[PDB]
């Protein structure tokens, strides 16, 4: 009545099931994951193969999907393992593993293509001729929540200029201490944006209203826009927590096709839901149910990122390995 199957609840894995669905419905990622050359891999320690297995089961099982081989492969297996890590670290663990496994293959560079951006930050001395520029690659964008009404205010905060003056005067080395500015602008924004909302600070949880839109235009935060490719982003996933830091229940909302038809993914129960439940009902306020992670897809890349996946996208070598595994266990 959905067409989508859920993930088993097998312990306090917090954000993990939400993230797994989120990555699974990044269809371009999914197809590249299927292409990884894992035939030689040791199952009990291969996270690239365990992610293939999970995606295979999500695409083909009609019953809820287990993850125990996956949490074994990356070694988080104690009661509170997932409560000592956060979703940004698990994102990096999964994406870096699969990135490396595609090095040297037909899908090499898929992870950077989908997820890498570039920024530039600078220090410009106000009163002598010295500037330091720093270009670096990024993956996700951590957005400050506390004291920000909406995602626009957070991006404004992200790129707000900082005065280095008086007591925090920048030392320009040869020039000694100098008044300077520090600032930031994005050079590029990747096809898939993972925005991490800083609700869980230090240990606390900010439950305040934080408004985020269905279509998110970001041209204003680039150093140079172009026309006929505006940085216009479409909301794909809303990863949600309920509670006050202490444990809590984790759920993800997705419109997997990018068409604004939303579903709620609540471990083994995938149910269909209103757009209001996915968006405005996760703004929070003063409710303690609210987004901590948003996934946006660039409008110009959406058809690309959400390209149809068929059974023919999963190699035979892999299908046969996974079905043989099932034979053994039975």
């Amino acid at each position: 009545h959905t067409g989508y199957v859920g993930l088993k609840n097998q312990g306090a894995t917090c954000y993990m099931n939400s993230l797994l669905q989120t990555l699974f419905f990044t269809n371009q990622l999914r197809k590249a994951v299927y292409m990884m050359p894992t035939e030689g891999d040791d199952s009990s320690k291969s996270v690239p193969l365990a992610l293939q297995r999970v995606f295979y089961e999500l695409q083909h099982s009609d019953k809820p999907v287990g993850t125990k081989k996956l949490t074994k492969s990356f070694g988080w297996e104690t009661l509170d393992s997932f409560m000592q890590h956060d979703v940004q670290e698990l994102c990096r663990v999964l994406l870096d593993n699969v990135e490396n496994k595609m090095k040297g293959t037909c899908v090499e560079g898929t992870i950077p293509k989908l997820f890498r951006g570039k920024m530039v930050s600078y220090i410009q001395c106000k009163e002598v001729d010295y500037r330091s520029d720093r270009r670096e690659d990024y993956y996700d964008i951590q957005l400050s929540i506390k004291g920000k009404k909406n995602i626009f205010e957070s991006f404004v905060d992200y790129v707000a200029v900082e005065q280095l003056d008086g007591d925090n005067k920048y030392d320009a080395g040869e020039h000694g201490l100098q008044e300077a500015e520090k600032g930031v602008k994005f050079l590029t924004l990747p096809p898939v944006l993972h925005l991490q909302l800083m609700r869980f600070m230090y240990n606390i949880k900010i439950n305040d209203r934080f408004e985020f839109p269905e279509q998110l235009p970001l041209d204003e935060f680039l150093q140079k826009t172009d026309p006929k490719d505006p940085a216009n982003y479409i909301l794909h996933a809303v990863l949600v927590h309920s509670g006050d830091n202490h444990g809590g229940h984790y759920v993800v909302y997705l419109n997997p096709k990018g068409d604004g038809k939303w579903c709620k993914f609540d471990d083994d129960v995938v149910s269909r839901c209103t757009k209001e439940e996915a968006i405005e009902h996760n703004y929070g306020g003063h409710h303690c149910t609210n987004a901590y992670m948003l996934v946006y897809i660039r409008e110009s890349k959406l058809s690309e990122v959400l390209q149809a996946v068929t059974d023919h996208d999963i190699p035979q070598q892999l299908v046969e390995r996974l079905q043989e595994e099932k034979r053994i266990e039975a």
Binding site: D96, S121, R134, E136, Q142, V184
Partner: peptide
């Protein structure tokens, strides 16, 4: 890690 001390692209260990 990025200029702002947030995590950047890839795996970078503990601060």
């Amino acid at each position: 890690f990025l200029x702002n001390x947030x995590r950047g692209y890839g795996l970078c260990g503990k601060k």
